């Protein structure tokens, strides 16, 4: 099936639990499509910004899996303000910040913080995270789950 096909099932607000069946399927799909990365970030940005917490949560988990399964071609897309601004809008009180849940917000920050470490190459990711702090959105570096592959 198609990218949206996979994502829709992988982020369905009805799911009783995470369905890693579709999460991985969305990932390999991205790895097949000549424009999988470009298309995927756009799709993910939208799901992550959904008013339905469970949909955004699953979307974030899917985004996390793509970071580990879709290599550099995916990283490059995430490392752009085009996508990053969409995540900022989720935690920034100026935009969607005052409506999104603490669950979604902290998850997003955890990931951004994580990427500044794992992808020292992606300067835009650092600038994005740094702003969030300089703007009081993030009071301090959050603790994160142990993952030794984060270089």
């Amino acid at each position: 099936e198609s990218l949206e096909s996979w994502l829709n099932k992988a982020t369905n607000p009805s799911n009783r639990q995470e369905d890693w069946e579709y999460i991985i399927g969305f990932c390999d799909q991205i790895n097949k499509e000549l424009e999988g990365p470009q298309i995927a970030v756009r799709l993910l940005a939208h799901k992550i910004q959904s008013p339905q917490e469970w949909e955004a949560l699953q979307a974030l988990t899917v985004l996390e899996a793509c970071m580990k399964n879709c290599g550099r071609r995916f990283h490059n897309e995430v490392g752009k303000f085009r996508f990053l601004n969409e995540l900022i809008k989720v935690v920034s009180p100026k935009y969607l910040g005052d409506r999104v849940s603490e669950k979604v917000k902290t998850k997003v920050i955890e990931l951004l913080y994580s990427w500044t470490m794992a992808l020292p190459e992606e300067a835009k990711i650092k600038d994005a995270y740094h702003m969030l702090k300089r703007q009081g959105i993030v009071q301090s570096d959050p603790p994160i789950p142990v993952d030794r592959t984060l270089i």
Binding site: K80, F81, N85, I88, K124, M131
Partner: peptide
């Protein structure tokens, strides 16, 4: 690509 928010 554009600029940061």
């Amino acid at each position: 690509d554009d600029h940061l928010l």
